[PDB]
Design a binder for this molecule. Structure first.
Ligand SMILES: [Cl-]
Ligand SMILES: [Cl-]
Ligand code: NA
Ligand code: NA
Ligand code: NA
Lengths: 360, 358
């Protein structure tokens, strides 16, 4: 048997209490004698779980009342197209800040639907940094300005957010939502696939300023209108009921541990273990990110050559590390250290790194 | 003391749920949950492929069809289909046999020209139209049907021979309830939560050469070609839902497959329909007898006071989900593959006792 150190990038490690709770009641949820998986989405029993998940997110992120929490299917990827479908109208511009591959994927879908613009980009700096907000090129007819808060593939992250008042600020927060407190009122819309930091795959969380998106859009398919899901409270069609249930369990765990401030402290400590190991390695491990733009959620690094990368990753696999290979598009290594990844897995990664360097 | 007649999501096979429970924290000796695996891992890829292979075996899906696992429900397919096939100068042709048929047509109308090949709307969706009635156009992009009209309780007994354009079927509420000649279709889709497991995955069986070409101007996530080329791993799939689907398909396989399940479904439907038919009009089925669904049994008592009394008694006695869909009222006993015959018997007994006490 191998120990498990789960550095998977999404889906990812879950809190053991959330899983254990799910296991215990999998056949009989809340004395109904049915699994949560067997309930109608039109039942009170399910509605209670759906509402509880929203209310927990609201409490934990301090979401103001004029925002609504949607639970959608399709991943963050579907949001790449649904956002411009809803807001990118003739005469306006979808303005994007490019800070990684996920930013590019979002921009690509907007280009199919309307005029786009690049407000700022660190592509020429190999996505090693977040641009200075003073670099942002904005347009009066921007439909929105879109950012990617945590650039999962490159391991960079916004340390704080721009103050934008000329157009709605929109963020793909898939890989750092609820890793720390967040001033939601800075944004018109936030979206996140749940499978990094909120739960399992199969549901996408969208926090939307209601008045921004609660109007039907001409000619847009029913399922692709935010208004449909706003009006229907994410019950227009059949939701991913078990995913939402698991989201509820994960949010309860975050609340039990002390909320967003407590998890931020844990995440900062975890990240420091790994970054100090990189920095103290005299170049044996080299981080992709510039220090000032380092992600607390995905730590990306390389050894001095591909042969060493491969040897390191093979050793890691032998020793029980899961998911440490970088995203296939970039190679290297990526330690994903979302909320539920335990600090002791980070300690183990440090030990592996120190030993590998000494035995090289 | 609970009888689960929910219409979707719905009852699951006990062995599939027990299996999931047992290994929820330690899937296949990995010491993690299936929910904690990367979709880019061999461990998950094996489950993904096994689910496909089980479906392929159980429905005898030919080699020239591919099995996709998508998000969005059957409802997203209502728009994704015409986005991919309803091109300028062609027609999305629909057979209307219920509410779900109308919802599919509505989405196509947003995207191009449509046509009604046949409809039983004027007969209150009490029947499936004779195929001889179908009006077909040389420029049809496809002909779309709904195999089981979940809200109205009617069901195609067999399927039309359509070769001028691909036949497309929303089989959400009866997929894998019986054997199917898949080669009659260009595409079959089904939300999993009626008969294949839990919500959050939609199964799409597609003739590969029909839909494997990129369609200009369609968003990447909404092209079938994206998912075909990527084997439903373009973006992150609903991994737990696909795992559960695998478990349910294994249960179907273990009891003898689609013929065995059809036999069980016919037996348990008979219990309810015989109860209706012997009631001297006290219970009246919505469907014409020759169009009766084996998956959703719809009926009413003689008036709304009696409907309410019956449904209240049912609730008191532990029956879940018998109220008709909110769009039509009355009663609906959903009797998908995993609903046990003993629940159908309990429903019969409830119905007989209620009439006796009325
Ligand atoms: Cl990225
Ligand atoms: Cl229907
Ligand atoms: Na509906
Ligand atoms: Na450091
Ligand atoms: Na990708």
């Amino acid at each position: 048997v191998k120990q498990v150190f789960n550095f998977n990038a999404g889906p990812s490690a879950l809190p053991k209490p959330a899983l254990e709770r799910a296991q215990k009641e999998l056949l009989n949820f809340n004395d109904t004698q049915m699994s949560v998986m067997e309930l109608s989405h039109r039942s009170q029993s399910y509605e209670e779980v759906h509402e509880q998940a929203q209310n927990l997110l609201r409490e934990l992120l301090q979401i103001p009342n004029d925002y609504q929490i949607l639970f959608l299917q399709g991943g963050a990827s579907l949001q790449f197209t649904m956002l411009p479908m809803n807001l990118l109208t003739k005469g306006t511009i979808g303005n994007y800040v490019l800070t990684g591959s996920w930013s590019e994927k979002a921009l690509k879908e907007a280009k199919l639907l309307g005029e786009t613009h690049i407000a700022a980009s660190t592509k020429a700096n190999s996505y090693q940094s977040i641009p200075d907000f003073s670099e942002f090129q904005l347009n009066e007819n921007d439909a929105y300005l879109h950012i990617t808060s945590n650039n999962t593939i490159y391991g960079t992250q916004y340390q704080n957010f721009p103050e934008i008042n000329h157009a709605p600020l929109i963020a793909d927060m898939s890989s750092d939502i609820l890793s720390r407190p967040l001033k939601v009122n800075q944004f018109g819309m936030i979206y996140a696939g749940a499978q990094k930091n909120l739960g399992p795959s199969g549901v996408t969380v969208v926090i939307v300023k209601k008045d921004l998106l609660n109007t039907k859009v001409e000619q847009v398919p029913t399922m692709l209108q935010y208004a449909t899901h706003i009006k229907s409270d994410s019950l227009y069609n059949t939701p991913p009921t078990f995913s939402i249930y698991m989201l509820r369990n994960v949010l309860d765990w975050i609340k039990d541990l002390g909320g967003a401030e407590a998890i931020a402290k844990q995440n900062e400590e975890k990240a420091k273990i790994i970054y100090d190991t990189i920095d103290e390695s005299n170049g044996f491990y080299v981080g992709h990110a510039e220090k000032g733009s380092r992600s607390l959620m995905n730590v990306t690094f390389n050894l001095r050559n591909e042969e060493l990368n491969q040897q390191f990753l093979a050793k890691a696999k032998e020793q029980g590390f899961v998911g440490l290979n970088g995203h296939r598009s970039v190679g290297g290594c990526r330690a994903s250290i979302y909320n539920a990844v335990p600090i002791d897995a980070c300690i183990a990664l440090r030990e592996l790194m120190i030993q590998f360097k000494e035995n090289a």
